[PDB]
Design a protein around this nucleic acid. Structure first.
Length: 66
DNA sequence: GCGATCGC
DNA sequence: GCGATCGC
């Protein structure tokens, strides 16, 4: 029940971490896709503004071996 | 341009 | 196959 705030295309947006499908890092930017009502939405935030919970999801993605 | 994806 | 995007 953690919300992530970001600005994609001028607009401000919030998505519950529960709808995030994938997370990854590019420098100090935490990037992700989420379930945008059936389709793939994209967003990113500074690691400085990443809710702890999103950072935990990132660490988990970075731990990945698949 | 990185990572990754969408929309061409 | 690359530009726009996001933050840097």
């Amino acid at each position: 029940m953690v919300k992530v705030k970001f600005k994609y295309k001028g607009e401000e947006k919030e998505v519950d971490t529960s709808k995030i499908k994938k997370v990854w890092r590019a420098g100090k930017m935490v990037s992700f896709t989420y379930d945008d009502n059936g389709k793939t939405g994209r967003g990113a935030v500074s690691e400085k503004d990443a809710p702890k919970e999103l950072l935990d999801m990132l660490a988990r993605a970075e731990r990945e071996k698949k």
